[PDB]
Structure formats: C-alpha cells, structure tokens
Amino acid sequence: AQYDISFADVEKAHINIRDSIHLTPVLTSSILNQLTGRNLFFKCELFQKTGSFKIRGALNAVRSLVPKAVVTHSSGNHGQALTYAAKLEGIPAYIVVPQTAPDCKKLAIQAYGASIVYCEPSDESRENVAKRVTEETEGIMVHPNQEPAVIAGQGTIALEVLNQVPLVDALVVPVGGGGMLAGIAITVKALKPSVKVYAAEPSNADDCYQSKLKGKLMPNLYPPETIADGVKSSIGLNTWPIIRDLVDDIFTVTEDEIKCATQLVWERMKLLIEPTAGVGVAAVLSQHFQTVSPEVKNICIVLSGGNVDLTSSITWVKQA
Amino acid sequence: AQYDISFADVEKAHINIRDSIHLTPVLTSSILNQLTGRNLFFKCELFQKTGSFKIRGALNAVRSLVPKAVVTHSSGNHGQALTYAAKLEGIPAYIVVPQTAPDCKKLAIQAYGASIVYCEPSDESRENVAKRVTEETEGIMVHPNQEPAVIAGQGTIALEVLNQVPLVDALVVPVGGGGMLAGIAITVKALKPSVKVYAAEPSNADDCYQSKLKGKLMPNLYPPETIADGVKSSIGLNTWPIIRDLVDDIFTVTEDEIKCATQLVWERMKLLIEPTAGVGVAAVLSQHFQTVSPEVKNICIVLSGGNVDLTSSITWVKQA
Ligand SMILES: [Mn+2]
Ligand SMILES: [Mn+2]
Fold first, then answer.
1. By C-alpha distance, which of A298, A68, A59 is closest to A171?
2. Across the interface, which of B25, B107, B319 has its CB nearest the CB of A311?
3. So which residues of A are the catalytic ones?
4. Residue A192, SS3?
5. What is the three-state SS of A105-164?
6. Across the beta sheet with A249-253, what order do the strands follow?
7. Is the distance from CB of A297 to CB of A38 less than 8 angstroms?
8. Cα distance between residue B151 and residue A313, in whole Å
9. Is A245 exposed, middle or buried (0-12, 13-18, 19+ CB in 10 A)?
10. How many domains does chain A have?
11. What is the distance of C-alpha A293 from the center of its chain?
12. CB contact under 8 A, B270 and A272
C-alpha cells in the first residue's frame, strides 16, 4: 500500500527536472522486431546528460536535499551524474568507486571535478567506504538506488514512455539496485497497471530474480562478475518491497546473451549502448521471453546508458 | 542555369520515397556546441534503412528506371542500398566493390543477396568493371553518384533539414562523388539560397577542393588512402558543374582530424558513425572553419552513415 515513494513524488520530480534533462527519443528497429516477433520501442537514455538516465535521480536528489559536499558510491554512472548535478550548485562531490569500474567512468567522474575514492568491488566495501567518507567530509550521502528522491527521479522515465508510446504493453528495465525498476513500477502501476513491468538481470548477478523466487531479499553472496558493470549491486531495502509487489516478472540473461545483444544494437541500430543497457535487449531476445503472451505486443526497452570503454569492448566483440 | 537535376526532381523524389525511408532525427550536443562556438544540429542518416542515406538515391533510381538485373560499383553503402531496393522489386543485383572495402560492407551486400564482384581500388577499375558486368548481365547500371535519379534522391535530405531546423544557416556535407552534395546544393539554393552549403573532404582525397580551386574537374591522380572509406571516389561530370556553381566552400580535414572527430561523436553523442561521416564533424571542428562568419550560427552536419567495422576501428581509437 505505501512504499518509500509514491506516484506523486514522481510527477513532482518530473516537473522539477524536466527543464534540465533531455526528453530522449524512442527509436525502433525492424530487424529487432523480426527477431522477436514483437513491436519494440527503444527509450534512448544513452543520449541523456552524462550518458545515462542517472541524471534524473541525481538532479532530483540535489535539488531536494536542501551542504558541505555530496557523497555516494557508484560503478560510475550515478557518480558522474551526481557530480554534475552538484557542480551546478557549487557543491563538491566525493565519489566512492570500485577499483574495477571502467576507466571511462573513472575518468569522467574526475573530469566533472569530483574527488574519486577507490574501494573494493563489493556492496559491503562500497557502502562502508561511502559511510566513512560521509562522516569524514561531513557531507550528505545520496545513495545510487535506495534514496527516495533518486528513485522518484528515475521513475520519470515511465512518464515519458507512456506518453511517447501510447500503445505500450510492457516496459523492460535492467535491474541493479532497483532504483529505476522501482520508480518505473510505481509509475506504470499508478497510471496504467495493465502495462507490464519486466526486469532484466544478468544470470551472473541474479539477486533480484532469486529474491522474487524466494519471496525475500537475497543479496549476492559473492561480488558478481559480469560485463554488465552497472548492475552489480544487489537490490536494497527500499526497492525490494516495490519490486516484490509491483514488478510482473524478471528475466535473466547470460553473459553471452548480453554480449550478443549489445553488439547487435551497435551494428544494427548504430547506438553505442553500454553492455549494461544490452541486458534488457537480451531479455527480449531470450528464449524465456517467448513465453510472454502474444497480447504483450508493444514493448519498450530502456537503453539505460552509453558509457562504454571502446577499447575494452574489443576483447569481446564477435567476428562474423 | 540548367544542371542534370532540378529542384522539382528532388521534390518528386521525396514524395516517391518518403513512405519507404525513415524521417531521421536531428540531434544536438552541448559539448560539440562548446567546442565550436556554433549551434550544431546533426542529421542522423546513420539511422536510415541500410545504415546510410544511400537508400534515398537507390530507391529513387530503382522506382524510376522502369529489367534483368541492376549493376553498380560501390565502396559498400550504395551497393547495399541498391541491393535492398532492387530486392524489393524482385530484381537481382550485381555489385562491383573494391577489394579493400570494409568487411562489414562486403558482408552486408552479400546478406541482401547480391552477387559481389571485387575490383581494384581505383575509380578506373570500379568504372571499367561495372561497365563489363553491365554488358555481361544485360543489366541496368545505377551509378552511385552521377545518375540523376540518384542525385535527386540524395537531395531530399535537405528538404527534411530545412523543415526540421527552420533556423538553419548552413549545411555541412561530406563529399565523395558529389551526389549528395549536389542534390543538397540544388535543393537549398532553390528554397533558401542564403543558407550556406559547405563540403567537407579528406585532405587525403581532395579532388573536390582542388577542382574548386582550379575552376575545373581534377580527379584524384592516385587512389586515395583514407579511413574515410566512403569518399574515395572523385567527383564526376554531372555533379561538378553543380558543385562549381552552388557550393559555398570546401573544407579539408586530415586523417587525424577525422579519427578524432569520429571518436568524439562515439564517446559524446553515443552515435556509431562511420569514419566517413566523421568528415563533416571534423570540418566544423577545424581551424579553417573558424574563419566562417559568426553570422553562420546554426549549422546542420549530415551524419551520413554508420556502417563501420567495430574491430578494425580499434586499430585507431586513441586512448586517453
Ligand atoms: Mn542483480
Ligand atoms: Mn574527394
């Protein structure tokens, strides 16, 4: 009944950020339609300010939380977005980043003027270090996915999608911490609950899937190994209840599927998505998705970001 | 006064192809605006059917030229577009392609069902082989840039741009054979001749520049070596007069500039342009472009194609 955000929070966030973000386009692909048998729509958040949708939750959080500094932990995208948002107000940013995050993300964070602080690649390390930095700097913590203002910001994506694709039957959303999935679920289920909300998740980081299956929050026991570098976080205490109750299903995809789907988008849509964003595309291409009812025809997939290391990616790109 | 096409040809082409092509979007970048001091608009032909604008001239040509087969020579983009267009009518295609064309383009041509015929990398070889194949197959030749129906098809880009960017002050167009540049020049100068039409050309393939300078057609003496694989052709007899009289200026760009600009678009706009399409971006970023009057503020650059070999490109991508 009551979750940590409401639809009204999202509507408000939208008004309050819309003049500072892009109303990103929805693009289509006949090749992907052919491959899936569905009518796909791609919400291009890769074109958002800073390279990902995270500017939404960051701007909303900065504006709303009334400071000496802002602090967060991030695999890169929330960090750069938060940095940018804070810089606009003249507030310094400290960003805790796992040592194994992509270089491109590490560099962008520094380019926006943040103090970057490397941690170990685990949820525990991210959280503990950010807590310590918060204390040391007397800054304000802006969590990448569990903070209500952030979740409400991410949910604004759905307000746009429902307007841009009026006949939409489902949204497909990549899931890490569940900030975006939760905000979108709140939004869709408030406006038009007949529209499906589906999560897409790496098999190699499948806490959300396992949580849903078990009926309780089950965080990743070991730090995930995945090319989907932006969804290694486990779901949290604020997003789980929303996901439990409002998300229709969760589809897992293997590393191979993620790589194949990412490459397909690059080659056929000419959109430089990051592999994390290739998760949702893989989901719709997957065998299990074939079990979704044929009535679920018009599907919008969120292409969540385009912050990818071009040279790293050559490692996995598949020759014909 | 009279050239091989007229504005009316372009208007007609537009009506006749518009239901079979995409009305591609115009995107913007604040980073590129900052770098240039101008207000840039990017016409995303990389999102066109087949990966480039060439579907325009191909569809127009196929529909218009009333056949046993169609024949052409191409570095890849016109070939795949022509193949697709012909396949829609059930007509076989023979495509003459230089041995050194990108694999991705060679493969796509074959995927669309063409018979591919490799030639040497020269204008002379392309032309001579296509003539022979034309004779042998009793097919119809559809030249990639000198055929009036093709030129008129490419010019339709300008009809869209002038509508999408009503305040436009200049178009910047990459030039190879001059099919697109010529069609666009005819169009712009007929509708609103105050709008500048500028060509962008590799220094390593600078026939168009040299022709303009000398006041006569001066083809490349040696086969160009350039990463801009799609603009190695020299201008021809039908496009030159149009270029001579209607194009405002021609900007040359070095290989380094082309690589830098291409990479910038990839990283900052998330648009998987091919290097040929990076030619026009390089032009606007170039030192010489700084000499263009500050009144020329709103500039639309045509991102002409996105048919690039991902793995080849790793050779030149510059680390930070
Ligand atoms: Mn997960
Ligand atoms: Mn040239």
1. A298
2. B319
3. 54, 75
4. coil
5. HHHHHHHCCCEEEEECCCHHHHHHHHHHHHHHHCCEECCCCCCHHHHHHHCHHHHHHHHH
6. A26-27, A39-44, A298-303, A170-174, A196-202, A249-253
7. yes
8. 38
9. exposed
10. 2
11. 26
12. yes
Residues contacting A68, CB < 8 A, separation 6+: A92, A137, A138, A139, A140
Q: How distant is the Cα of B67 from the closest Cα of chain A, in angstroms?
A: 28
First to last CA, chain A: 51
Same domain flag for B33 and B83: no
Q: Please name the method used to determine this structure.
A: X-ray
CATH number at residue B60: 3.40.50.1100
B contacts of A27 (beta carbons < 8 Å): 47
CB contact under 8 A, B317 and A310: yes
Ligand that lies nearest to the alpha carbon of residue A145, given by its number in the listed order: 1
Same domain, A17 and A119: no
Strand partners, B27: B42
Q: Is the dihedral of CA B268, B308, B320, B225 positive or negative?
A: negative
Q: Which residues of B touch A319 (CB under 8 A)?
A: 311
Residues 6+ apart with CB under 8 A from B266: A272, A310, B272, B273
Residues B151 and B226 in one domain: yes
Whether B317 and A306 lie within 8 Å, measured CB to CB: no
Residues B311, B166 contacting (CB under 8 angstroms):
no
Token reading at B1: 């006064």
- Among B123, B145, B167, the domain boundary falls at B145
CA of A37 relative to ligand 1 center, distance in Å: 27
Which domain covers residue B114, as residue numbers?
Answer: 53-145
Contacts B103 to A, Cβ<8 Å: 320
Q: Do the chains contact at A270 and B267, CB–CB below 8 Å?
A: no
CA-based nearest distance B271→chain A, Å = 5
